[PDB]
Nucleic acid binder design. Structure first.
Ligand SMILES: [Zn+2]
Ligand SMILES: [Zn+2]
Lengths: 645, 645
RNA sequence: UUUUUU
């Protein structure tokens, strides 16, 4: 749908800055106008109240452009007098997007006075005194609970003359109290306007004289991971190709031999092949296990699927960006078909068809007609292992050759020949190469998020959410490959691509400690390189916070760590560390859930309240907050934590 | 707006109990159908997924009636094939409402097998094993986070035979983990159906042979507080009339003396008069300070404005209910114009006009046309004092005779004749008597709620919310009294009447300890009598929990308590108690907000982190959780806390 | 925001 203007904040003419708001659209009008992208309302003022399906925030007009945050608006069109207006500017790096200001909209003029006395206008038309501190930061004269600032992103910071200094994007909090604000300065809007809206990164970058990082944006099947490195190799270059998937990485061996007559080296956890060829395929995980960049080994490093936001890819790419030049490379290529900000466009091979309530097989509130999947080879994406098992058991009950696939299972359970309805989670994508006659997509994803809940410390929460544009493109892309495909779906939308949660940063530190023998300080250097690099997925900068937390987690019980590592579940280090503190305190775990199985051996001996460090799931036992590590982590919580409102 | 069926949960018809969801309507259709109240979709199944504008939950058909929870549906109609269906049963006491089941709806059969193995069907078609343990309680075999049961209000609990045992209304939580569930049993549906559909409480109750608690539901202006007690008195009875407000109580006295020829006793903080007459007027607050019911003094006690959910009224009515019979009363009358479940209905003398965006005067997102208040006498309700000052300031500066009124101010500032526009908070309700040509209503108000946030204990927060039906009808009733009147409004709905927050219970214990020398045990007795009485406002039963908290708050500093009581702000006991702990620790208060003003003179001596007991506002200072009282309150948080989901 | 008891 489109972003919709549903009100405005009117600013005063002069003398003491004041504001009041007007609501011009209800809920029904917002939903309708969002669906059609056609809004015939007349626009007034320089600050608009805008809304999506589920969220409401602000947009500020400067220099004929209506500006807001990428994290709120994504890549969405704005509903306009003659239909949806396509974004004219999209700067994920700066968390900034802009549409051509509709007629009737007035702009603020960029500030030039250099005043540091600023005034933030909130979505409730409050005018809040702010003292400028940096190019992008200002302190609140009166700290306020972060909830006071909710929905105010996109709102203007004004100088005393009423000129635009920037737009609000996030609150800097101390234990949930906003003491400062982070904003996108006007200078950043200027820079965005005068960058060329069309940068072509569709051709393989040329190897430069001195080190550069370049982007390669090319459609799936265009040969980013095969044709491109083989071309480079032909020119005499040594090339390393990094990819998140073991199945994909192995697959490159055979394909390169027959397609380009190169027998590349192959590096994965499960299998290493050294031929001495000038092209090497590695997973990010194996690259990290190997210690990163070996000096002099490569001229070119291609980070394939560089849009991926799993911790391994992020930490691996950060390692490349920090180490490549010193290891002698001249070119780092960040390769993807779907860079941040990208949206899913129609595909000629793929017919897209909404599911209805007609059909014999219930599926996420809708239904799948049996004739749609009886005969042929089909893939159905579910959000969870349980739903896969269920659906597969049911389809099997109707004599449908159905198999469930997900993490844990071996790919051999999928027959590479003959009819079959595969019911899988996203684990399919990294574990199995191959396409289908149709894809049916629940359009949701299970994701992890951090909450700085202070009860006592933080919580890592798992929730089911609407899929983003990368998820949609990749699930859909399992059909229509050199064949006419069909894509069936529950919902038509897609969340904005190219952002990830702070919890993923937590995962990186965890992996560094657990698998890769990285001190938290070293993990930070790598993640800092990632964060400093334009054109990649973006995340709140909580590096100093997470580093501080892991830095305090000393003398882990090597035995428990071995067990969580082997067991293969999330946060092996944090889980092993809580188990360690428990055992040394001679106390029980937060629960006897499976997450804590490494403790069973001690079950009869462990008693009293849990010295809880943080929340990684439900806590059923009683809790004590007396442990020194709990107190240390609680102390870490007082750090500036920038969060979106 | 109506409740709208937006999907269904289809139950297995044989063998093991299973379920799946069918979604029949999107957000758009929902909003449209809610507004029109007409829904032509065929209805199928026994379990419906239902939504309003803000929330979604379940409804279950039993015995030809579609049942759900009052806390979800309020008194709302259901969208039906020929228009809105009004509720056939509205039982606020049991949190149960029912519509006559539409055509196509099947009904679950009542369970009469006594099976203790139950299955709860969730809004997501999950089937959850539950062990029955009481008439209305069941334990989860696998405790889950409360979030999991979100939106399952109204879902069925089934026995192994697929019969209906009851409907889910709330979770019983241990530190946020649902360990058991509260449900409305089918027996309550049975008793509901077997009591009359209509009842009349419009006439003053006859004095019964033996002690009875009775209800008087009669419109404002009908003489509930004057004509009624006069008539009782004329029959030879001694009457005590209790009312929340001093102004009201003094007003009735003066009136009764001239228009009903008797000089009533009067008991208020500011004015107490003993005339020896048979009728006495008192505030609930003075009645409490008097120690409650005095033996033999009254035949009849009229608890006027018994819908009121302020702590003084609730504790005062609970005291009447615990004490009256033993004190020799013959009759308690619970009198109100707006009992729980009531709604604001169209009023002949009142034309109701929605504000639009056309007007010179900005008002809560809309505007007031200057020609609607330029000549005459009008009343404007704002949610805060600030707004009242600011709107008065603007209006006067536009040539309109505008006056601001709210708590603290002299009532006389209101011209009793001649063109005026009064901008007021709800203080006008008790504080000033008299009509206006029209009322303009912001439709919101300020309320407090508790969050069991465990960070470390609980939080009381103040928020601005949409008004309820009591609020709407009361504000609207200030015009159209005998004459023609106009009611103008920002928004058209109203939240259900007759419910209050657990934070009010907290305030009752606070006032018990601060003002009335009640031990928490004694307060629990009076509150329990209130909660056990049918037909009064309802609240979650957290008496044991709150009693336990206050029981641990011993040896308060009398000086701090004297100051917080005198300053008139909420929770004087909790505030003075946190101050006591800080002062004795030489530690600062949570912040230097005015809430903590009693510590201002000690400021130079206070250092280090606040030993935080609970959160009553923003906490700016660092905190420690080591204090014994903090630890005691943290332990209180382990009690069963029943909460809606 | 209302309301009360000192
Ligand atoms: Zn300026
Ligand atoms: Zn039964």
């Amino acid at each position: 749908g489109s972003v919709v203007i549903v009100g405005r904040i009117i600013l005063s003419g002069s003398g003491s800055i004041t504001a009041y708001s007007q609501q011009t659209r209800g809920l029904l009008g917002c939903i309708i106008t969002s669906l059609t992208g056609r809004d015939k309302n007349q626009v007034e003022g320089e600050v608009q109240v805008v809304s999506t399906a589920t969220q409401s925030f602000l947009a500020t007009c400067v220099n004929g452009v209506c500006w807001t945050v990428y994290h709120g608006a994504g890549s969405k069109t704005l509903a306009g007098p003659k239909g949806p207006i396509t974004q004219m500017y999209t700067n994920v790096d700066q968390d900034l997007v802009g549409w051509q200001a509709p007629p009737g909209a007035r702009s603020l003029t960029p500030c030039t006075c250099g005043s540091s006395d600023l005034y933030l206008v909130t979505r409730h038309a409050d005018v809040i005194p702010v003292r400028r501190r940096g190019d992008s930061r200002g302190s609140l004269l009166s700290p306020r609970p972060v909830s006071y600032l909710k929905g105010s992103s996109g709102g203007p910071l004004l100088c005393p003359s009423g000129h635009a200094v920037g737009i609000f994007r996030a609150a800097v909090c101390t234990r949930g109290v906003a003491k400062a604000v982070d904003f996108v300065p006007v200078e950043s809007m200027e820079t965005t306007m005068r960058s060329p809206v069309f940068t072509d990164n569709s051709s393989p970058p040329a190897v430069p004289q001195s080190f550069q990082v370049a982007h390669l944006h090319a459609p799936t099947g265009s040969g980013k991971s095969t044709k491109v490195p083989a071309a480079y190799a032909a020119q005499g270059y040594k090339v390393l190709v990094l990819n998140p998937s073991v199945a994909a990485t192995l697959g490159f061996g055979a394909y390169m031999s027959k397609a380009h007559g190169i027998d590349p080296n192959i590096r994965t956890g499960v299998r290493t092949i050294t031929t001495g060829a000038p092209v090497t395929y590695s997973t990010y995980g194996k690259f990290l296990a190997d210690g990163g960049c070996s000096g002099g080994a490569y001229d070119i490093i291609i980070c394939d699927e560089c849009h991926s936001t799993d911790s391994t890819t992020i930490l691996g790419i950060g390692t490349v960006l920090d180490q490549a030049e010193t290891a002698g490379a001249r070119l780092v290529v960040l390769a993807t078909a779907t860079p941040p900000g990208s949206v899913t466009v129609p595909h000629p091979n793929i017919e897209e068809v909404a599911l209805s309530n007609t059909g014999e097989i219930p599926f996420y509130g809708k239904a799948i007609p049996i004739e749609a999947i009886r005969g042929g080879r089909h893939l159905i994406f579910c959000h969870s292992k349980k739903k896969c098992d269920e659906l597969a058991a049911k389809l099997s009950g109707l004599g449908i050759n159905a198999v469930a696939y997900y993490r844990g299972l071996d790919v051999s359970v999928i027959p590479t020949i003959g009819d079959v309805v595969v019911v899988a989670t996203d684990a399919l994508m990294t574990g199995y190469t191959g396409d289908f006659d149709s894809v049916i997509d629940c359009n949701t994803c299970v994701t992890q998020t951090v909450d700085f809940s202070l009860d006592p410390t933080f919580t890592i929460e798992t929730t089911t959410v609407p899929q983003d544009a990368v998820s949609r493109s990749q699930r859909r892309g399992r059909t229509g490959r050199g064949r006419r495909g069909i894509y069936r779906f529950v919902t038509p939308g897609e969340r904005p691509s190219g952002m990830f949660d702070s919890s993923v940063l937590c995962e990186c530190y965890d992996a560094g400690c657990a698998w890769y023998e990285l001190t938290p300080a070293e993990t930070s250097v790598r993640l800092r390189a990632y964060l400093n690099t334009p054109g990649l997925p973006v995340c709140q900068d909580h590096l100093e916070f997470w580093e501080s937390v892991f830095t305090g987690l000393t003398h882990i019980d090597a035995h428990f760590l071995s067990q969580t590592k082997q067991a293969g579940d999330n946060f092996p280090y944090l889980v092993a560390y809580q188990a360690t503190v428990c055992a040394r305190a001679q106390a029980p775990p937060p629960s006897w859930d499976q997450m804590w199985k490494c403790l069973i051996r001690l079950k009869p001996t462990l008693h009293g309240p849990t010295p809880l460090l943080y929340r990684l799931g439900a806590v059923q036992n009683e809790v004590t907050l007396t442990h020194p590590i709990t107190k240390y982590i609680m102390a870490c919580m007082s750090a500036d934590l920038e969060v979106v409102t």
